[PDB]
């Protein structure tokens, strides 16, 4: 076929990044593969997110439309890095007529955790690529909350993703974008943090615009508790040894705006009060015969905005 067992490929993960992997099982019906990575973890990966190595004997055929047919207006261009060939019109945006580097390779170089490269040749090149989407946005089918689509197409990259796991939603097109694919963030994203106003490159026709929304103490409590729940894979967290230290030691990264006006000696009481006041959000360890100062979420769900 196109993919076989034991084949080494590049798989795009839900963080928008590429990882080396080996195909273990091929499902031609659902078009997914069981892929094993370097840390011996195994996950299902859609075929659209699997990049096979270019063949030395697959000379000048479009890796997208598979045709060798060439026409004046639409020539074939070979990527300098991955050696895959594209028709000029089978690449988004249009590949220039002939040191060209294709969209995925541009992303593979520029994308970094905490945000992609912000300045440099590859940073400017990715911005150019990010002016367009490699998929039809209006063709996507969303759930009720506009959190996920059945195509599993997100972001500038077109890769998979979970909205709550380091992604930002554009206020204009309502699409979700990977942290690693953005170039506008100064601090790392927390899990489930929607307290942003974000607008993508496509909607602006240029650089992204991002703004931090003002959090309340109940938001801080909920966000930290949710973020730690996901990170640490557990429900209950000690206030004095886990919750408060995370908040205080990482205070600047949390971008809490006006809350920085609160005297540092008071921060503990404000946060703890929020945890004890909203019994509809937070459950105390007392409810299961443990420490009163143990707290958790009733439902491990992100902090609601407003
Ligand atoms: Zn992405
Ligand atoms: Zn083509
Ligand atoms: Zn390439
Ligand atoms: Zn947008």
From Swiss-Prot:
Q: What is the effect of changing residue 37 to A?
A: Abolishes histone H3K36me3-binding
Q: What is this protein called?
A: PHD finger protein 1
Q: What is its main location?
A: nucleus
Q: Tell me the tissue specificity.
A: Highest levels in heart, skeletal muscle, and pancreas, lower levels in brain, placenta, lung, liver and kidney.
Where does the protein end up?
A: Nucleus; Cytoplasm, Cytoskeleton, Microtubule organizing center, Centrosome
Domain writeup: The Tudor domain recognizes and binds H3K36me3.
UniProt disease link:
A chromosomal aberration involving PHF1 may be a cause of endometrial stromal tumors. Translocation t(6;7)(p21;p22) with JAZF1. Translocation t(1;6)(p34;p21) with MEAF6.
Q: Does the keyword Phosphoprotein apply?
A: yes
- Per the database record, which ranges form the Tudor domain? 1-58
Q: State the protein's purpose.
A: Polycomb group (PcG) that specifically binds histone H3 trimethylated at 'Lys-36' (H3K36me3) and recruits the PRC2 complex. Involved in DNA damage response and is recruited at double-strand breaks (DSBs). Acts by binding to H3K36me3, a mark for transcriptional activation, and recruiting the PRC2 complex: it is however unclear whether recruitment of the PRC2 complex to H3K36me3 leads to enhance or inhibit H3K27me3 methylation mediated by the PRC2 complex.
Note the zinc finger regions (PHD-type) by start and end residue. 59-108, 152-206
Alphabetically list the UniProt keywords. Chromatin regulator, Chromosomal rearrangement, Cytoplasm, Cytoskeleton, DNA damage, Metal-binding, Nucleus, Phosphoprotein, Repeat, Repressor, Transcription, Transcription regulation, Zinc, Zinc-finger
What assembly does the database describe for this protein? Answer: Interacts with CHMP1. Associated component of the PRC2 complex. Interacts with p53/TP53.
Annotated GO biological process: DNA repair-dependent chromatin remodeling; negative regulation of gene expression, epigenetic
* Record annotation: effect of changing residue 38 to K: Impairs histone H3K36me3-binding
Q: Which organism is it from?
A: Homo sapiens
Q: Name one GO molecular function term.
A: DNA binding
Q: An example Gene Ontology cellular component term from the record?
A: centrosome
Family in the record = Belongs to the Polycomblike family.
């Amino acid at each position: 076929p196109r993919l076989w067992e034991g084949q080494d490929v590049l798989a795009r993960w839900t963080d928008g990044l590429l990882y080396l992997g080996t195909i273990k099982k091929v499902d031609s019906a659902r078009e997914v593969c069981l892929v094993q990575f370097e840390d011996d973890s195994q996950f299902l990966v859609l075929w659209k997110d699997i990049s096979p190595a270019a063949l030395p004997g697959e000379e000048l055929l479009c890796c997208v439309c598979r045709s060798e047919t060439v026409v004046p207006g639409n020539r074939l261009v070979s990527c300098e890095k991955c050696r895959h060939a594209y028709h000029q019109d089978c690449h988004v945006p249009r590949a220039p007529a002939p040191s060209w580097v294709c969209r995925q390779c541009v992303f593979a170089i520029a994308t970094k955790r905490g945000g992609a490269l912000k300045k440099g040749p590859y940073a400017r090149a990715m911005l150019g690529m990010k002016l367009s989407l490699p998929y039809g946005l209006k063709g996507l089918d969303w759930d009720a909350g506009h959190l996920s689509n059945r195509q599993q197409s997100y972001c500038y990259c077109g890769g998979p993703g979970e909205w709550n796991l380091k992604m930002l939603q554009c206020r204009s097109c309502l699409q979700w974008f990977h942290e690693a694919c953005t170039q506008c963030l100064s601090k790392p994203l927390l899990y489930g943090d929607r307290f942003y106003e974000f607008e993508c490159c496509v909607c602006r026709g240029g650089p992204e615009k991002v703004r931090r929304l003002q959090l309340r103490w109940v938001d801080v409590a909920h966000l930290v508790l949710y973020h730690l729940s996901v990170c640490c894979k557990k429900k209950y967290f000690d206030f004095d040894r886990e919750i408060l230290p995370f908040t205080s030691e990482n205070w600047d990264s949390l971008l809490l705006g006006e809350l920085s006006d609160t005297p540092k000696g008071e921060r503990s009481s404000r946060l703890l009060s929020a945890l004890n006041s909203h019994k509809d959000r937070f459950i105390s360890g007392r409810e299961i015969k443990k420490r009163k100062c143990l707290f958790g979420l009733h439902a491990r769900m992100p902090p609601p905005v407003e």
